Design a protein around this ligand. Structure first.
Ligand SMILES: NNC(=O)c1ccc(-c2ccccc2Cl)o1
Ligand SMILES: [Mn+2]
Ligand SMILES: [Mn+2]
Ligand code: NA
Length: 262
């Protein structure tokens, strides 16, 4: 149950992915102490609608109320932007964006450290991004997703961190969440061999403490059960003939857009 994108569709995914990445590049300057997550969401939405001439794929998805997800510190994902929630010195914050342009989805997120970074916050973000990077370097036809998931987990746990099990990467295209499911840990259920033309995301959620999570009573905000810090990075990619191409690369990424093997 895997869809292979055509050359024309891949190009449309390049545009959509570029826009998603540019939302993150655009919002960066605004992520400072004192700003509310609510205003950040409005800034992102105005940019997506009025500048990119695109739309947020998150607003309305399964009932999601905002345009982007903004998760702070112990919040694992789906943090709901609120005008009463202000960023403060030392915070680590994930902004997850998904835009739809010309029928295709671009999905990506990154961590931002607010004000003076704490060594542990910086470490968690660094390791989480590196876990995404190592997985990306493994992508190529013939490899099984189980191997990639196993590699992410092994690396993350070697750092004394844990991998959230409830959420996974996913196929993406005209649909937000398409097959296959891309687990970030080793599961005996996973058996998917990559093929050229497949487009999916890798978005590991890593906790500094234990893997268990808790959903708040707003039905969206997810936090670590032990309230330890949590970080996430995500990229949308297309499998090429001998590797992959990152469709949501940013200027601050320290990995190449085109990853070729041999
Ligand atoms: N930006 N929002 C998202 O990425 C989002 C909101 C809700 C979900 C979701 C994803 C997989 C399964 C169920 C849900 Cl409510 O993702
Ligand atoms: Mn996302
Ligand atoms: Mn995603
Ligand atoms: Na977090």
């Amino acid at each position: 149950a895997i869809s292979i994108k055509t050359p024309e569709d891949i190009e449309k995914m390049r545009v959509a992915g570029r826009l998603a990445a540019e939302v993150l590049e655009m919002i960066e300057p605004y992520v400072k102490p004192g700003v509310s997550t609510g205003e950040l969401d409005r800034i992102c939405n105005d940019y997506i609608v009025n500048e990119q001439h695109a739309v947020s794929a998150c607003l309305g998805y399964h009932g999601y109320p905002k345009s982007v997800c903004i998760s702070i510190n112990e919040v694992v994902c789906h943090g709901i932007p609120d005008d009463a929630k202000l960023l403060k010195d030392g915070d680590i914050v994930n902004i997850d964006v998904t835009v739809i342009k010309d029928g295709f989805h671009g999905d990506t997120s990154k961590m931002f450290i607010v004000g003076k970074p704490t060594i542990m916050g910086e470490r968690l973000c660094r390791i989480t991004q590196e876990s995404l990077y190592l997985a990306l370097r493994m992508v190529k036809p013939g490899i099984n997703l189980r191997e990639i998931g196993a590699a992410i987990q092994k690396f993350v746990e070697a750092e004394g961190f844990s991998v959230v099990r409830e959420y996974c990467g996913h196929g993406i295209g005209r649909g937000f969440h398409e097959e296959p499911q891309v687990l970030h840990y080793d599961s005996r259920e996973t058996n998917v061999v990559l093929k050229p033309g497949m487009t999916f995301t890798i978005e590991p959620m890593v906790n500094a403490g234990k893997k268990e999570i808790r959903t708040m009573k707003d039905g969206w905000t997810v936090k670590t059960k032990d309230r330890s810090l949590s970080a996430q990075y995500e990229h949308t990619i297309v499998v090429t003939d001998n590797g992959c191409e990152i469709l949501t690369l940013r200027k601050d990424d320290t990995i190449p857009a085109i990853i070729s093997h041999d």
